[PDB]
Predict the structure of Lipoprotein, YaeC family.
Amino acid sequence: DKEITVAVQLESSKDILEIAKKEAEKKGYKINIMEVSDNVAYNDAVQHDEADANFAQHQPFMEMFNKEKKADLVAVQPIYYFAGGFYSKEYQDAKDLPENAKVGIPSDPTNEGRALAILNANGVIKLKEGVGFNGTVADVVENPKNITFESIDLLNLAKAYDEKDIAMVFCYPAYLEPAGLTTKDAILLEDKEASKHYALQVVTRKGEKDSEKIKVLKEAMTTKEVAEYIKKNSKGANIPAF
Amino acid sequence: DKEITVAVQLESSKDILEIAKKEAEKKGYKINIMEVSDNVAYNDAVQHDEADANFAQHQPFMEMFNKEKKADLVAVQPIYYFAGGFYSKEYQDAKDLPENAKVGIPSDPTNEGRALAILNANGVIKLKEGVGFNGTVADVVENPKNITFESIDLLNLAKAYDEKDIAMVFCYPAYLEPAGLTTKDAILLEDKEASKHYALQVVTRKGEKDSEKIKVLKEAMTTKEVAEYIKKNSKGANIPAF
Ligand code: NA
Ligand code: NA
Ligand SMILES: [Zn+2]
Ligand SMILES: [Zn+2]
Ligand SMILES: [Zn+2]
Ligand SMILES: [Zn+2]
Ligand SMILES: [Zn+2]
Ligand SMILES: [Zn+2]
Ligand SMILES: [Zn+2]
Ligand SMILES: [Zn+2]
Ligand SMILES: [Zn+2]
Ligand SMILES: [Zn+2]
C-alpha cells in the first residue's frame, strides 16, 4: 500500500499537509487528509488503524490520550512551536500586579500546566517541587500576592484581556489578533525550550514508527517549502521545529 | 444580602431559572442569572464566591471538578433527568449486532462511563468488577462480539447514527430530533435509577448548603410550575426529579 492517511483538525494543519502531499506524490505516495472537528477523533483514528498518522497535537497532549486509552501513540517529528505568554492591559510587568489580583489561565489541564510553568519560571508563584509542566493550581506552594487563578476557556482568554477585574491573562499568539496584540506585548513570555516541549508533532502508532509510509511523511513535512509556509502563513507566530 | 447569583450554561437552564426568579421575587429575593458558555466557568464561579450556586451539571460531573480543584461543591437538589440509550439504524436489538461491530460512545470520561454502564447492565459487554458508572473501554473484561468502541464527540453522535460502518450509537434525547428519533426507537434504554444518578442538580459550596439563600433557591425551583415547564419545554424528554 502506497497511501498515507493523516488525520488533522485545524485548517492550518490541513494546509501544511497539502504542501507535504505534493512532495509525497513525487515519491509515489498518496497522502489522504482526514479532517476532524474535535480533539479526540484524530487519536481514535490512529489508535484504530483508521489513519496512519495525525498532525494535530503536542506530545504532552498525546501522552494524556495514551494514559486514558492504554494506547501506544508516539511522537515522531516536531513540526513547529509557538510562545505562550501573559498579557496585561494595565500593568507593565508582573512585579506590579496588585495584591489579590485575578490572573486568567486556561481551564484544561495540559494548558493550565503550561501557563503555571511560565509563572513558576518567572517567580510569580512557586509550584511544588518537581511538578514541572504538570502543575495545577492546587500545586501552588507560594503565592506572595495571593493571586486568584481564574480558570478560563482557551477561546475566552483574549476577551478576558479586556475584563476589568482580570489583571493579566495567558494567551497564545493565534488568539492575539482581535485584541490588537503581538508576543512583543507579552509581560511574561515562555522560553524557547519550554515552547519546544509543546511543539506540534507528527504522531503514529509505536509499531508503525519505523515504517516506510511514516518515513516518507516525515521527509515531506520537513522541507524548505514547509518551513517557509509555516512562517509565512502564521505571520511569524509559528516557528519551524526543524 | 437578598440576591442569589446562579450560574447556567444552557438556554433551557436559564429558562427554568427565569421561572424560579418569579417565585423567589415574591419571597423578597432577587435571582441574578449568570450565563456562561463553557463547562468550567459555572464551577469556577461558585468556587470563587462569584456565584452562589449553579444549575448546569449532574453530581458525577461536579465531583470531577472537586477532585481536580480540591474544591468543595455539593449537590443540593436534583431537578430533572433524562434517559441515555443506544440507537441502531440497521439492527433491531443488541443480540443481532455483527461480530467486530463498531459502537459509538461519548468521548469524554463521564459520558463514556454512563454509556458503558448501560451496555454492562444489558450484557453486551462485561466491565471489570466494581467500576460501576466509572468504566472506561480499558475496563472491558468480556467482549464476546469483539466490539470496537468508537470514541465520538457528544455533538457528533447523532450523525454517527447514519454512518455506514457504525452498528449502533449512544445518544441523548435532546440530540435525536434531526435524526428523526425518540427514546421509543432505542434498542437499549438506560434504566430510571441510572438516569437519576445523572440528574441535573442545584450546586453550591458545602459551607453554603444550609443558607437561607440556597433554601429559597431550592424551594423556587421545585414548584408545580417548574415541573410543568420542564416536561413541556423538553417535549417529554426531561423528567422532573421532584
Ligand atoms: Na471576572
Ligand atoms: Na467510521
Ligand atoms: Zn487554508
Ligand atoms: Zn523532494
Ligand atoms: Zn473565578
Ligand atoms: Zn520537554
Ligand atoms: Zn532542520
Ligand atoms: Zn429560552
Ligand atoms: Zn410560592
Ligand atoms: Zn476509531
Ligand atoms: Zn447513584
Ligand atoms: Zn416531589
